[PDB]
Structures are given as structure tokens and as C-alpha cells.
Amino acid sequence: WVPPEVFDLVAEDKARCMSEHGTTQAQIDDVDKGNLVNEPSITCYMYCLLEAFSLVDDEANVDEDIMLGLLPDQLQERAQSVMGKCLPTSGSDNCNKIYNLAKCVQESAPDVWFVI
């Protein structure tokens, strides 16, 4: 009569991206509180996490409709204004593109930090 096994989607996706890039819990805690650094082990994790959610493609191009789709109706205009300052992405590789995007988001709206 058993209850199902309950899979925490987010924790699965985070887990899989960590083990792929050698990312430590410490590093993801740093990102979770707004501290960014341009180190592949953590920045490729950020690229990986976004990709898992279809927010980016295999080149770290942002899907704007899906990214705006993460946020409530009340924040759409602020997000679009940040997206007009930070997109299209750019950098040396997929990981660096996401570092530069995360840094561009932080300085454009420094008072809030949005995490998955």
C-alpha cells in the first residue's frame, strides 16, 4: 500500500550539476548569498543549473521568455530592464558567460539576490 518515493527536483538537479563539476557545498552557499567569483568549478555549476531549467542553451544564450517566466508578474519590468542591460551573454566559454551574467545582474539590482 506504499507511498511513493518523493524526488526533490531541485535537489536532484543541484546534486547532478555539483558532481559533474566538482563543486562543493561551501561554494554553492557563497553563491546563494551573492558572493561571486570567476572560478569554473562554481561558475560551470551555475551554467549547469540554468541549463537544467532550460534558461540557457548549449551556448549559454538566455531564453528570455523562460527566464522572465521564473518571476512573478510584479517583477517583470525590473527583470526586463536588467535583461536589457545584461543580454545577450558574452565571455570566453559557457561558464564565464554565466559568471559575467550573474555579476551583471548583481550590480544592476544590488539590493536583491534571486536564487533557485
Instruction: Quote the Cα angle for 9-12-13, to 5°.
Output: 85
Instruction: Tell me which residue has cell 552557499.
Output: 29
Residue 111 binds to a copy of itself (criterion: CB under 8 A): yes
Residue-wise over 37-67: b if at least 16 C-beta within 10 A, else e?
eeebebbbbbbbbbbbbebbeeebebeeeeb
The interface mask with a copy of itself, positions 35-74, x = CB under 8 A, is ----------------xxxx----------xx--xxxxx-
Q: Is the dihedral of CA 60, 43, 92, 106 positive or negative?
A: positive
Stretch that binds a copy of itself, among 29-37, 39-47, 87-95 (CB under 8 A): 29-37
Q: Tell me how far, at minimum, the Cβ of 87 lies from Cl ion, in Å.
A: 4
Residue 113 sits in the site that holds a copy of itself (CB under 8 A):
yes
Instruction: Return residues touching a copy of itself (CB under 8 A).
Output: 1-10, 12-13, 16, 32-34, 51-54, 65-66, 69-73, 75, 106-107, 109-116
